[PDB]
Amino acid sequence: INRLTKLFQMVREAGGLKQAYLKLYRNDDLKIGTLVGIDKYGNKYFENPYYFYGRNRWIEFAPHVNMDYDGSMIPAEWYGWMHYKTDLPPIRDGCRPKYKWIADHSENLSGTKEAYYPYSTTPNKVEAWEPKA
Amino acid sequence: RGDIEKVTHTGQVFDKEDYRNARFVNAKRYVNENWGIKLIEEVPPKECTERVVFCDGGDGPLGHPKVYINLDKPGNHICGYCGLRFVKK
Amino acid sequence: ALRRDVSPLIQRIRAFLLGREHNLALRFEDGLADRTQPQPEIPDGPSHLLSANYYCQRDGRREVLPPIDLVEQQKQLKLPTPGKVYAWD
Amino acid sequence: ALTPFFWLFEEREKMMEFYERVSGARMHAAYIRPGGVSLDMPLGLMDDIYEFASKFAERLDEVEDVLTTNRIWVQRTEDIGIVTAEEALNYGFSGVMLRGSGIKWDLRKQQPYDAYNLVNFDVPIGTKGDCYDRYLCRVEEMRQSLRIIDQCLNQMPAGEI
Amino acid sequence: EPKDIVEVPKGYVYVNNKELSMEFADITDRAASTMFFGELLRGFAVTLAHIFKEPATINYPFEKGPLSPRFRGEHALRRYPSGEERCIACKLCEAICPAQAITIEAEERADGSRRTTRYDIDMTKCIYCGFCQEACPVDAIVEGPNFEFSTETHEELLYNKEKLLCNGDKWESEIASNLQADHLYR
Amino acid sequence: DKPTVRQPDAVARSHLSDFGRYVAECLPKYVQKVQLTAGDELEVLIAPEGVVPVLQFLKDHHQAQFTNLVDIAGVDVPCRKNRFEVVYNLLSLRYNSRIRVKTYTDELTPLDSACEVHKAANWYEREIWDMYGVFFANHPDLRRILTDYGFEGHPQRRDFPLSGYVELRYDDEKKRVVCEPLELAQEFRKFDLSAPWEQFPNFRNANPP
Amino acid sequence: PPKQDLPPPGGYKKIPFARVPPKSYFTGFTTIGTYVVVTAVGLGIYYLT
Amino acid sequence: QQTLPVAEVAQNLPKKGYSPFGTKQSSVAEWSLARLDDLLNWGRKGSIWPLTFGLACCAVEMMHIAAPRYDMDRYGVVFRASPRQADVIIVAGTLTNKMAPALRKVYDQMPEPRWVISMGSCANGGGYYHYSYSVVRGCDRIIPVDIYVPGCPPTAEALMYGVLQLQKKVKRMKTLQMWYRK
Amino acid sequence: IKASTGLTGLAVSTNPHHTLSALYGKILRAVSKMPQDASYRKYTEQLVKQRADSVAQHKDITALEKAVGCGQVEELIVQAENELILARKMLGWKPWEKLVQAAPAKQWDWPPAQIMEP
Ligand code: SF4
Ligand code: SF4
Ligand code: SF4
Numbered sequence A: 001i002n003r004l005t006k007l008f009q010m011v012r013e014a015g016g017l018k019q020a021y022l023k024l025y026r027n028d029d030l031k032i033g034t035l036v037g038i039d040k041y042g043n044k045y046f047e048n049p050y051y052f053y054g055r056n057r058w059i060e061f062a063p064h065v066n067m068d069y070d071g072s073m074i075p076a077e078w079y080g081w082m083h084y085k086t087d088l089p090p091i092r093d094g095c096r097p098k099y100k101w102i103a104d105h106s107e108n109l110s111g112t113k114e115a116y117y118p119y120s121t122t123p124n125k126v127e128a129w130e131p132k133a
Numbered sequence B: 001r002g003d004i005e006k007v008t009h010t011g012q013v014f015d016k017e018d019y020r021n022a023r024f025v026n027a028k029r030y031v032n033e034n035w036g037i038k039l040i041e042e043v044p045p046k047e048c049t050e051r052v053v054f055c056d057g058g059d060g061p062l063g064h065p066k067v068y069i070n071l072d073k074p075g076n077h078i079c080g081y082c083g084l085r086f087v088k089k
Numbered sequence C: 001a002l003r004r005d006v007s008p009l010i011q012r013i014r015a016f017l018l019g020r021e022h023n024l025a026l027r028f029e030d031g032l033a034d035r036t037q038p039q040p041e042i043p044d045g046p047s048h049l050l051s052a053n054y055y056c057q058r059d060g061r062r063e064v065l066p067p068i069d070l071v072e073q074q075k076q077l078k079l080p081t082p083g084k085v086y087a088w089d
Numbered sequence D: 001a002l003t004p005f006f007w008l009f010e011e012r013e014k015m016m017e018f019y020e021r022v023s024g025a026r027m028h029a030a031y032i033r034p035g036g037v038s039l040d041m042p043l044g045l046m047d048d049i050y051e052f053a054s055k056f057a058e059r060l061d062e063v064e065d066v067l068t069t070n071r072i073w074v075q076r077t078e079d080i081g082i083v084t085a086e087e088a089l090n091y092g093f094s095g096v097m098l099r100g101s102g103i104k105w106d107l108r109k110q111q112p113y114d115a116y117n118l119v120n121f122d123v124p125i126g127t128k129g130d131c132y133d134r135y136l137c138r139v140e141e142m143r144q145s146l147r148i149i150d151q152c153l154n155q156m157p158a159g160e161i
Numbered sequence E: 001e002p003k004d005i006v007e008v009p010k011g012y013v014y015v016n017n018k019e020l021s022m023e024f025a026d027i028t029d030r031a032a033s034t035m036f037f038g039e040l041l042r043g044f045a046v047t048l049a050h051i052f053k054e055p056a057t058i059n060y061p062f063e064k065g066p067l068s069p070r071f072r073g074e075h076a077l078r079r080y081p082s083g084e085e086r087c088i089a090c091k092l093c094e095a096i097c098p099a100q101a102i103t104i105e106a107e108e109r110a111d112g113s114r115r116t117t118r119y120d121i122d123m124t125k126c127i128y129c130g131f132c133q134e135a136c137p138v139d140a141i142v143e144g145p146n147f148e149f150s151t152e153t154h155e156e157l158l159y160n161k162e163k164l165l166c167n168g169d170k171w172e173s174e175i176a177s178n179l180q181a182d183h184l185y186r
Numbered sequence F: 001d002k003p004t005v006r007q008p009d010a011v012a013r014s015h016l017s018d019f020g021r022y023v024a025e026c027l028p029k030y031v032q033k034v035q036l037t038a039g040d041e042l043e044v045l046i047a048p049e050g051v052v053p054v055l056q057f058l059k060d061h062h063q064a065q066f067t068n069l070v071d072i073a074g075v076d077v078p079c080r081k082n083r084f085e086v087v088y089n090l091l092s093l094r095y096n097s098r099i100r101v102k103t104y105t106d107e108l109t110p111l112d113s114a115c116e117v118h119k120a121a122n123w124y125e126r127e128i129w130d131m132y133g134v135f136f137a138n139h140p141d142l143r144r145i146l147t148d149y150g151f152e153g154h155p156q157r158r159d160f161p162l163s164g165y166v167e168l169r170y171d172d173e174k175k176r177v178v179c180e181p182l183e184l185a186q187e188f189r190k191f192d193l194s195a196p197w198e199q200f201p202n203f204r205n206a207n208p209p
Numbered sequence G: 001p002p003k004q005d006l007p008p009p010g011g012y013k014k015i016p017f018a019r020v021p022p023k024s025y026f027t028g029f030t031t032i033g034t035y036v037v038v039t040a041v042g043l044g045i046y047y048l049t
Numbered sequence H: 001q002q003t004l005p006v007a008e009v010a011q012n013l014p015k016k017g018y019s020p021f022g023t024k025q026s027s028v029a030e031w032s033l034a035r036l037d038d039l040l041n042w043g044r045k046g047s048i049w050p051l052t053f054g055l056a057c058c059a060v061e062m063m064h065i066a067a068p069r070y071d072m073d074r075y076g077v078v079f080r081a082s083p084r085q086a087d088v089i090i091v092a093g094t095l096t097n098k099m100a101p102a103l104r105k106v107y108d109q110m111p112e113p114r115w116v117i118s119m120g121s122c123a124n125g126g127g128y129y130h131y132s133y134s135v136v137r138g139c140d141r142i143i144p145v146d147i148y149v150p151g152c153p154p155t156a157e158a159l160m161y162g163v164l165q166l167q168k169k170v171k172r173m174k175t176l177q178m179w180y181r182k
Numbered sequence I: 001i002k003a004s005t006g007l008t009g010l011a012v013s014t015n016p017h018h019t020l021s022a023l024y025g026k027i028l029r030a031v032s033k034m035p036q037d038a039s040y041r042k043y044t045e046q047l048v049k050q051r052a053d054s055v056a057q058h059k060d061i062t063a064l065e066k067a068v069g070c071g072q073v074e075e076l077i078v079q080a081e082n083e084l085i086l087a088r089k090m091l092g093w094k095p096w097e098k099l100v101q102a103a104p105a106k107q108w109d110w111p112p113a114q115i116m117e118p
């Protein structure tokens, strides 16, 4: 009866029908939310209590990805906030550590030249006698 | 690539002639760069005055079991669990 | 306002169909309890007392005895039924 | 029939959040242990257990409307698979199969082993021993179990786990 | 209301006990439904009513969860804030692992600290029970929040220490937050 | 006075003790021994031949009315000469009680089937034959129920290796799955979970010769 | 502020468990009576057509 | 492990594009096949039909993927019964020896192109019963496996993430583009 | 007359007083054939009298069930039909005799496999 007024609004922040369509084509949904924060890699995190619990907090993947978005691109900083483990975004909590050995996030790399492959981590135990010397 | 010949902190590496490197032609060999032996060595020792002190890993219930160390000897003393060093002067 | 629900007209229509006022199944942040809660202070046990708590009394494992032989333990010392009658009908 | 599967597995999904929230796994909690459960319930769980229970009656009514009185449902179940009472005992039957055919037997009442002593609830019984009444027993068991939670949530003491 | 064929004792509920009335007022009522699909009518009202509800679907992966801090997922070897690995090769985790999914070989390190030269978890044998993280006396091994690590090869599911250590660095921030918010219960 | 220790149910203990003796008089030919377990559960150790008689007596007698047969568990003990023991768990709805009947048999000697008394033992006996190799005479049709077709051996005997002798794999030459001698990538790592100090002194001198 | 998950002061409200049947609008006579009327009018309009 | 690009570095990277083959084909014939190869992959990617195997207690979590919370059907995934119409098989549970010939046959009857998903530890490597006398130590001993979903059971999202990996694996097949070189 | 037994597949009994009386009468005859010192003969003979007289003493089945307890009259018949089978079968087994099979050594020993020091 009055969802159009919401619908027009979604366009305005979207940037006109042209950017609205690309948003719909990408996220498969148009939703109103407040930008909670931005991670190191460009993903923008939104929140709106209007929606029900599961759909309450959502993420916009970085534009350059454009269709390779994965569930595994979420860095550990925001990971808890995104799965409702906490109600406190990383900006609003000071209990996060900043150790020097922490590593930047990475995808799950499978079927790729960058994948994992196991190997025994122990050098061989028995030494063979060398005849040459 | 570089990673194949890299030697891990545990001291293992496949010889350049060993066939087992074949597994890495289509994958990578992550060798961790944050070697614990060097990071703990970096942290300086803690000077104390009392004859015996305790280390619990630094965060009580989130650390390791509380162990007491005796500082009578000259050399700085290592904690069994965390590796931190203590010294009395 | 606070709930993303369909317009008033459809709510009446939906209410008519179900034959009963409807409570929305979907959970909303307001109904639930906050995901970051204060930390607990779980109570102790009955046997955290500091005295008169000898394990030799509290322990149950060392009190079990072997099976008792019914026929012999008389010799050394209404018809019967396995238990009490029940009306399973 | 398809819809009852989805209307109920939506509630089933909510229920396995409580498994996930206390044990850490949605299934195979590995929570109950010989000394009692392995951890205390998280703070604020019981409020959400209540919230689920308060709404679960409505969900079961809607499925009941579409299934219980459905003419087709009765025909697909009524007088199919009759279990006479004397047959059941000889077979090692138990549970709803035993109570489907009119036997008044429920281990919670006869040989109580937990707080079942401290709660009061009914037991559903069926007279015809067919699929249909056995189905009704399962639905009725879900009503009574929802009654037990009403007493557990209120009578829970504070103490060691 | 009709009567009950079998009188009911206390603490028992019957499902098919009421008999069928034979008054014309009731027979016609049953007849009308049996004759104009009356029972099925309300069944159709209910299903149509569900068209006018917000569906409960979640737009994964953009929206996902919810979970709890106790969630058991992929493994990771933590380390102290100094950077030193927490694990001291006590081997409690190996002994308790129900699936025998853990293999550890330990050796006196160069600096003389008890440490592992090997720590392998066979993720295709683990059951994600979580006994390993309960048994570790120094919280070295934890089941991290990650549950999205499906691979395209069986071999990639066998984690060695370097893989496990990498996870303990990629996921360090979130694990340290879960332990803090959960250790008191445990 | 002590909460951790479980409280014994004396009233249930009292009835089972007396009724335990009662069975001993009614069936002298078969009842070797009657004992009340520490769990306040009654066990009736019978001779191998007294299976069908004793089971019939408990099901039909007014006082017993153990109408419901719940289980038939098999236990293998290589130490004993009659290594295989068979345990029946019966339930009496009318009297609200449980009783256990145990019997012993060798690898070869058959054990009289009790399908007659309680024909709930149609499959339970089939399982016992399959798992342990105890044959049941007069069974309707004895046949493996759990293991694979043509599976050789009886897996649940203590003298059977945990992993079995043969694995399965698919062989694209033969266009079918084939069985090969077992070959495990990682052995089953034993753990020696043996305590060097006895903890339960009550059972040190138990069972005099 | 409780330090353990416990029922609130005074306890939760009673949880509905009983079965509530939906609204009934039609009886045998009203259903049979309406149909005849509807058919009769239907024939009446059919004749004019 | 290759870490993700930083925002500023990523702020310059061009938009990825849909096709994994890019629009850098030298000839018209190659380029048409590349685009035509996308059309196949778009088709097969869209509608992946599992077989409804459901062996063991992973099977329950294979129902909740079809439950309204996650709704496999949103992605074009539709359960089916006959292996002829089924395109993917989700071996979810402990494949015992007695089953093993039955899975092989059911897999064989599935028409190409067929992809297999391994759910849970049981089907991955024998899982909790790895050493049992009557368990096939992983279904890869019997049929080729294309995705391994770890867990016990895998979470519903975990399987969903697995399915999306299979879509991406399907998306990058080179069935046509490699015929040209052949 | 009970409208229904309440149990599926169990029919209401006509003249339960007669059917019980015959069955108890039959049992005492089968039991009589057993040796006097047999403990089973002493118990059922004592028992069946306690059931038999109550059947004749009471003429109202509802009163009969209270007087005997132990379930509905239909079940009372079902019970009685059994001890005929047991008593008849047991005249063949002769259980009152001495122990048929002397127990082997260590055949009921728990825990197993321990050295016994003479
Ligand atoms: S979660 Fe359980 S099964 Fe998995 S590695 Fe840890 S202890 Fe072993
Ligand atoms: S229990 Fe912890 S400290 Fe001990 S070996 Fe395992 S990971 Fe290392
Ligand atoms: S992997 Fe775990 S959840 Fe899946 S079937 Fe095996 S035991 Fe069950």
Ligand SMILES: [Zn+2]
Binding pocket: B055, B056, B057, B064, B079, B080, B081, B082, B083, B084
């Ligand atoms: Zn320390």
